[PDB]
């Protein structure tokens, strides 16, 4: 028999974490591991049919992905879709495959709207989600005695696909249904220097625990302006939602990072503005089986796609696609062993949800609602040398914080500042 | 040859203005007229192929509309799409047909984002659009002398597909572009009383000229509370953006209306509560051919779809579909005259845009951007019997705000109130 996998991913543009340049090699490693294992689809063949999800302009689009998916379905009749990664591309395709009753695997599409499993009834997300960053923040608040109020800022940059809007959307909508805190949001524009001044004039009267989604340079500028204005960190703490650790040169591996240094000249005053700043980031798997996967992933990305991978946490999306496809194949074996069909769709997914699986990225846990439990890590500065490193990891399945090698969060006062001053603003 | 016309409208739900139950006989009167005109598309026939834009639940959907459009496009090769009306259903089809280069006619889909025309290329809107309401409001402001502040409120109701959000968005964006005026916006839930109380408590601090988009019976419980809180008509003006005249039994005739009358025991206070309120509706055509067309349309709607057309102002959407299809036929006729073809989407379209027409709704004019120029109307209270009637018709082609003969705006103080209180906020 033949099992057809439909890929709707950016084939030519190699700037997306889910681009076929990076995901492509990983799906090749996975599909050769099912062929080398007798206990996975014994005697069945797995073939991939490629469809693009991007314009003639090379950007993932909401009008090319649905049409590519429709063409793929009509011409190949896929068993499953490897799914777009972009939010606006994945939404229509998610609804379409929900109507067709075919699963949809994807390590992208992290927006909050995909958790409504009455519309995306068959969408399994094997990668990180923005909604599961809000139960990390809730646990962080509980550990540090924050129960009253917080503030959240996201930045507008025309190029991106509203990344911070969706990220803060998930964080905000999840951290106030399981906490009794008062959270308020606010939006500014990146590199509109007149907006930072207004933002600083507003912030003091809006909160003391602040979460910013922006680019690293925007965050560094805000930190410098806050230091100028006297928001010195004995009463403030700024969290930078840098999921992929792009301010930390990829955030993967043990190495001093010092993300406040750019040779700008004012990197001495940009050092004491970061001693009241934490950074939230995806967790780098530490498995010996994960580092061996990246090596051959990079090799085969160079051999077959002429693309050179740079280390970083952005490589956990290829690995999440690997794990998700392996999980799907193992759940499709059990559906056949029980007298089912490869085209159930509905019975296959329920053997993937509320299930825990061992992949290169570690021991997965696909929660009962489809999404996969995500792990994040917290970075803070070392007063000795002033370099950031991971200080506190969060295990998304057990939902409990873990310190690292006897590392304590560096608070200027020794203990976290309250989220409401003594004289309430 | 034959000219196929693909229809994507609700084929079974008769509760939408753009429902095939209503629009169905409207396009049948149009296609029965080209057959009677040797000078319109002489040596061709016209066919209609129907696709539904409805869930299994029975409502507009953004997954069934594009899928029906795709099936129609591939099974039949159309020359034009009569297009959905619901904004969330029309957007995907608009993008699809723009990609295929097939024109899209639609008297619905009034949202502001349909006018980009770098995305929705080849989309002629022959019916009302919410952006054109900002032009009417700007003319009102320039006439009545208030050019420094306004407040807009849109109510949220789970059922409707965010009608008031889109209406107020269009008005807000267009006013902001037309007037150097600072405006505020706010959203209140439709079905709870705490929201109304907080709204009235925080209204005196944000504006004196208020535009309200809400249900006909939720603007009357707001007007009662405002009267009870001392927000008399000396200081405030409350504009009810009731485009389809629900609060006025339709507003299709010259009879007195009394929107404040319910006979529930507090019908006396409501009459002096509505002395501070004006109502903004669409303009009902005043030409005899519109009345004859309605007379034929309601007979045909009953005699072919088993639907009893209500006598209201919501019937200008069927008439808009009729006029738009006749205009498209004229444009394609011209195109064929000059050695063209039915499939020249761009050339057929560019002859529709930026030119006037004579339908049953009057003398049309489609803006150079592709959107018909909309005419609005403004109702007011008679000081004698407290009956509502029109005082100001607005012509969108020449943007002239012309008052009815024998009628004038009646203000409690004899002249419009200021938009900024003399003392201050």
């Amino acid at each position: 028999g033949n099992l057809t996998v439909a890929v709707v991913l950016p084939l030519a543009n190699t700037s997306y974490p889910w681009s076929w340049a990076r995901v492509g090699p990983a799906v090749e490693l996975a599909l050769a591991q099912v062929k080398a294992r007798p206990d996975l689809l014994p005697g069945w063949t797995v073939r991939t049919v490629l469809g693009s999800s991007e314009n003639a302009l090379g950007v993932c689009s909401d009008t090319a992905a649905p049409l590519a998916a429709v063409d793929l379905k009509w011409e190949h009749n896929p068993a499953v879709f490897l799914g777009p990664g972009c939010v606006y591309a994945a939404a229509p395709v998610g609804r379409f495959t929900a109507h067709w009753r075919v699963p949809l695997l994807t390590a992208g599409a992290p927006a909050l709207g995909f958790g409504v499993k009455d519309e995306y009834a068959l969408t399994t997300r094997a990668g990180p989600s923005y909604a599961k960053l809000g139960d990390f923040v809730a646990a962080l608040h509980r550990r540090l005695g924050w129960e009253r109020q917080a503030l959240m800022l996201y930045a507008y940059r025309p190029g991106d696909e509203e990344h911070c809007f969706f990220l803060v959307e998930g964080l905000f909508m999840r951290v106030r249904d399981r906490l009794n805190i008062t959270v308020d949001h606010l939006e500014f524009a990146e590199d509109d220097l007149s907006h930072y001044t207004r933002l600083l004039r507003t912030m003091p009267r809006k909160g003391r625990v602040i979460y910013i989604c922006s680019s690293p340079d925007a965050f560094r500028t805000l930190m410098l302006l806050a230091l100028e204005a006297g928001l010195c960190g004995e009463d403030y703490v700024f969290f930078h939602l840098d999921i992929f650790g792009q301010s930390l040169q990829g955030g993967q591996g043990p190495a001093p990072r010092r993300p406040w240094e750019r040779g700008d000249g004012q990197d001495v005053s940009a050092r004491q503005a970061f001693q009241a700043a934490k950074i939230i980031t995806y967790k780098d798997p530490d498995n010996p089986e994960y580092l061996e996967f990246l090596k051959q992933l990079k090799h085969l990305a160079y051999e077959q796609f002429n693309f050179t991978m740079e280390d970083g946490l952005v490589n956990t999306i290829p690995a999440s696609f690997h794990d998700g496809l392996l999980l799907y194949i193992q759940a499709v074996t059990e559906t056949l062993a029980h007298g089912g069909t490869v085209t159930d769709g509905e019975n296959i997914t329920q053997r993937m949800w509320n299930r825990s699986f061992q992949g290169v990225t570690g021991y997965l846990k696909i929660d009962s609602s489809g999404d996969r439990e995500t792990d994040f890590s917290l970075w803070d500065m070392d007063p000795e040398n002033g370099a950031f490193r991971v200080v506190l990891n969060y295990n998304g399945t057990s939902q409990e914080l873990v310190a690292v090698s006897g590392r304590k969060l560096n608070w200027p006062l020794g203990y976290p500042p309250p989220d409401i001053p003594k004289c309430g603003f | 040859g034959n000219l196929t016309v693909a229809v994507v409208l609700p084929l079974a739900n008769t509760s939408y203005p753009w429902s095939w139950a209503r629009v169905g006989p409207a396009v049948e009167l149009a296609l029965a007229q080209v057959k009677a005109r040797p000078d319109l598309l002489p040596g061709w026939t016209v066919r209609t192929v129907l696709g539904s834009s409805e869930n299994a639940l029975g409502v507009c959907s953004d997954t069934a509309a594009p899928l029906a459009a795709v099936d129609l496009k591939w099974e039949h090769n159309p020359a034009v799409f009569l297009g959905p009306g619901c904004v969330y259903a029309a957007a995907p089809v608009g993008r699809f047909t723009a990609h295929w280069r097939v024109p899209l006619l639609t008297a619905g889909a009034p949202a502001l984002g349909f006018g980009v025309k770098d995305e929705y290329a080849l989309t002629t809107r022959a019916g009302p659009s919410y952006a054109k309401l900002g032009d009417f409001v700007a003319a009102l402001h320039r006439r009545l002398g208030w050019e420094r502040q306004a407040l807009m409120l849109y109510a949220y109701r789970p059922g409707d597909e965010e009608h008031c959000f889109f209406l107020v968005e269009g008005l807000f964006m267009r006013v902001r572009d037309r007037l150097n005026i600072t405006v505020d916006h706010l959203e209140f839930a439709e079905d709870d009383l705490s929201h109304y109380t907080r709204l009235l408590r925080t209204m005196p601090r944000k504006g004196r000229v208020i535009y309200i988009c809400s249900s006909p019976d939720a603007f009357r419980t707001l007007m009662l509370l405002a009267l009870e809180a001392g927000l008399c008509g000396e200081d405030y003006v409350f504009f009810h953006l009731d485009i389809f005249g629900q609060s006025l039994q339709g507003g299709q005739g010259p009879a007195p209306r009394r929107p404040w009358e319910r006979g529930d025991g507090q019908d006396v206070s409501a009459r002096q509560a509505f002395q501070a309120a004006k109502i903004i509706t669409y303009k009902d055509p005043d030409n005899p051919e519109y009345l004859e067309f309605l007379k034929q349309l309601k007979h045909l709607a009953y005699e072919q779809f088993n639907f009893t057309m209500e006598d209201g102002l919501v019937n200008t959407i069927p008439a808009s579909f009729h006029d738009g299809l006749l205009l498209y036929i004229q444009a394609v006729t011209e195109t064929l005259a000059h050695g063209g073809t039915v499939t020249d989407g761009e050339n057929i379209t560019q002859r529709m845009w930026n030119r006037s027409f004579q339908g049953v709704t009057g003398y049309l004019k489609i803006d150079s951007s592709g959107d018909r120029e909309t005419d609005f109307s403004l109702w007011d209270m008679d000081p004698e019997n407290g009956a509502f009637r029109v005082v100001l018709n607005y012509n969108g082609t020449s943007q002239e705000l012309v008052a009815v003969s024998g009628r004038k705006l009646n203000w409690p103080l004899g002249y419009p109130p200021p938009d900024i209180p003399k003392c201050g906020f």
Binding site: L186, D192 | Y88, A91, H185
Partner: peptide
């Protein structure tokens, strides 16, 4: 959902930051 978050993931409703707190 709130006045800003929890809508549909269509690009047609993202034209204006209406209902959201913004500086632009």
């Amino acid at each position: 959902r709130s006045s800003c978050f929890g809508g549909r993931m269509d690009r047609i409703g993202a034209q204006s930051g209406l209902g959201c707190n913004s500086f632009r």
